[PDB]
Amino acid sequence: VETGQTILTDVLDKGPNPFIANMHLKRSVFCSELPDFACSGSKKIRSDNIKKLTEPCVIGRPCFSNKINNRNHATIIIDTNYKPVFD
């Protein structure tokens, strides 16, 4: 699965979040194209999100549905050209 930058710097709960509800039982996750943080204007990845991603479940709901628990079988691999920076 190729997902978005949201699963790193954005709130995971929010509203309905198909960008996380599709990672249910997926054995690899590739969120490529890191927004290089060397230039000011790139949000730093929250360590809370890093901690949450390792937990064996995530919070996310699809539209017109009520299933909020998605299993986390994913090997999170992030493509980048620059060193990531956390808050």
Partner DNA sequence: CCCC
**Stretch 25-64: interaction string toward a copy of itself, x if CB under 8 A:** -------xxxxx-xxxx----xxx--xx--x-x-x-xxxx
73 binds, among DNA, a copy of itself, none (CB under 5 to 8 A by kind): none
Candidates 55, 64, 81, 87; binder of DNA (CB under 7 A) is 64
Please report, for residues 47, 60, 62, 77, the alpha-carbon distance to residue 51 in angstroms, rounded to integers and kept in the order given.
6, 16, 23, 15
Strand 29-30 with 57-59, pairing:
unpaired
| Torsion sign, CA atoms 12, 17, 21, 23 | negative
Shortest distance (Å) from residue 22 CB to DNA: 14
Binding site for DNA (CB under 7 A): 15-16, 63-64
